[PDB]
């Protein structure tokens, strides 16, 4: 809408008011990168026509959206200026991302954490680290949608990889800033016939990019690698590991079990009296409200709640370092294998009949809200 020549909008850096448009598209990154020779060639503004620039912007920025002809007129607004040269293809995907057709299939329907991971998949063509999420999740908290898409397009990572004339694509650069950052990029970017719309939870890179260890599974990276770079290893060897993953990646089998949350349970023969291993760690999940006369204080049975292995790292590791000075004055040798133990009567309250008392011995130590 603005001008027939516009390199940069919104005046974020000071040196874009004097910056020209790029007269030619930018070069490839200068490292070796053995994978990209098997890859198809990148599509730019000045080598290809508008039939395939629109398809690859749908194949990368829109994921695989299946935009119809009456669907997305906001993209048809933004595409009609790109064919007139009124904005570059760098600014065009800023107009695609800020549009509501990008919002109404990636922002409202996916989760809050998954919206950041799809933005690195579409705009930068990779998958972020945890520190890249934690700087991008505050823009969704304090500044909203429009400033968060400005963090990709006005970044220096975009302008060095694509510049003003190159459609976004999966850039294999060989020497990466982290060894995770290759194979988390590859896992985030599968090949054809995959979209983002069915996986309303993505749930697998949402927990590999969540904690900084637990790099993702090898068959989830041998799957979208290119060809004469996967073969003689995907006939039937890892192929059943690929199919068993695809029924788990599809329908979003939540990886509490095998990926993170890793608890050595006891064998089933060890208890056998608290039996029926379907119902082994189930508790009543009770909730009361007690407000007026509409309550629904509904008790549920809860699921097999696991020891969380970090609240047991707050407890028992950080605090409870109170086992200090434990010589406890070993005087009076006849004490019959017990410490100071009160008989501890504890009368269960005499509601006049059918209520009775039992007793139990226990070692007693005075608490810390006690004497002086």
């Amino acid at each position: 809408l603005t001008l027939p020549g516009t390199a940069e909008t919104n005046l974020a850096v000071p040196s874009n008011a004097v910056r020209k448009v790029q007269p030619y598209p930018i070069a490839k990154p200068p490292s070796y990168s053995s994978v990209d020779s098997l890859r198809p060639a990148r599509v730019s503004r000045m080598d290809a026509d508008w039939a395939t620039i629109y398809e690859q912007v749908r194949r990368q920025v829109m994921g695989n959206a299946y935009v119809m002809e009456g669907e997305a007129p906001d993209i048809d607004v933004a595409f009609s200026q790109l064919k007139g040269g009124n904005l570059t293809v760098r600014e065009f995907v800023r107009a695609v991302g800020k549009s509501a057709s990008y919002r109404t299939r990636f922002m409202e329907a996916k989760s809050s954490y998954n919206f950041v991971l799809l933005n690195f998949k579409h705009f930068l063509g990779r998958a972020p680290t945890q520190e890249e999420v934690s700087t991008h999740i505050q823009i969704l908290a304090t500044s909203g949608l429009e400033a968060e898409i400005d963090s990709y397009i006005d970044s220096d990572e975009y302008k060095a990889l694509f510049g003003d004339h190159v459609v976004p694509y999966v850039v294999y650069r060989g020497t990466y800033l982290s060894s995770e950052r290759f194979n988390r990029m590859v896992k985030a970017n599968p090949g054809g016939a995959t979209s983002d719309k069915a996986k309303s939870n993505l749930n697998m890179i949402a927990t590999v990019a969540a904690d900084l260890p637990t790099d993702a599974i090898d068959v989830m990276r041998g799957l979208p690698s290119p060809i004469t770079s996967e073969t003689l290893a995907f006939g039937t060897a890892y192929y059943w590991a690929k199919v068993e993953k695809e029924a788990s990646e599809g329908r979003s089998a939540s990886p509490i079990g095998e990926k993170i949350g890793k608890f050595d349970h006891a064998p089933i023969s060890t208890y056998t009296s608290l039996c029926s291993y379907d119902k082994v760690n189930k508790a009543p999940q009770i909730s009361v409200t007690n407000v007026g006369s509409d309550e629904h204080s509904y008790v549920s049975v809860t699921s097999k709640y696991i020891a969380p292995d970090m609240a047991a790292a707050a407890q028992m590791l950080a605090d409870c370092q109170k086992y200090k000075a434990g010589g406890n004055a070993p005087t009076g040798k006849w004490m019959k294998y017990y410490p100071g133990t009160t008989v501890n009567m504890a009368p269960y309250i005499s509601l006049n009949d059918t209520g009775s008392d039992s007793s139990r011995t226990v070692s007693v130590t005075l608490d810390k809200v006690k004497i002086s």
């Binding site: 002809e69 009456g70 669907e71 919002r103 922002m107 409202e108 304090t142 500044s143 909203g144 949608l145």
Partner: protein, 164 residues
């Protein structure tokens, strides 16, 4: 789907903020508007079989060509498919009077109409003739209230404008 609530809740979430006093102000209009459109819904639901019967054949009265062989209406059962094809449209404008926005009409009846009616050779001019026959047949003293006839007609021509 695209209601007046989902308009203001997603816009308050895309800004990343609480529901402000503009957004509480937008829902206050719905008390003044649901008293008129919800009785237009039950006037549609209580008369839905008549408005498909004596108005679905008005497309065939205008377009008497398409019952010829080799064309879009071949036998008796595709005409029975055609009265099924327009019953979903009268279901959807009943489905948008109850919402308050145009939400259930777009992705369920509109989005993708340029694809399926081009491949299966279904003429959209015969669709909109049957819908606009229902549009000009509204009146105040017989059908509904004088206010509900505005908004019931205001959903039907949006189906005309999106199909044409």
């Amino acid at each position: 789907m695209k209601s007046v609530i989902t308009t203001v809740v997603s816009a308050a979430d895309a800004a990343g903020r609480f529901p402000s006093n503009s957004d509480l102000e937008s829902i206050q209009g719905n008390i003044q508007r649901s008293a008129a459109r919800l009785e237009a819904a039950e006037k549609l639901a209580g008369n839905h079989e008549a408005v498909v019967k004596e108005a679905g054949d008005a497309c065939f009265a205008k377009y008497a060509y398409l019952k010829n062989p080799g064309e879009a209406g071949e036998n008796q059962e595709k005409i029975n498919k055609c009265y099924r094809d327009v019953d979903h449209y009268m279901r959807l404008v009943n489905y948008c009077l109850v919402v308050g926005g145009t939400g259930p009409l777009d992705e369920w009846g509109i989005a993708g109409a340029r694809e399926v009616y081009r491949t299966l050779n279904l003429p959209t001019s015969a669709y909109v003739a049957s819908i606009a026959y229902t549009r000009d047949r509204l009146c105040v003293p017989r059908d509904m209230s004088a206010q509900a006839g505005v908004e019931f007609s205001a959903y039907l021509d949006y189906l005309i404008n999106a199909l044409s």
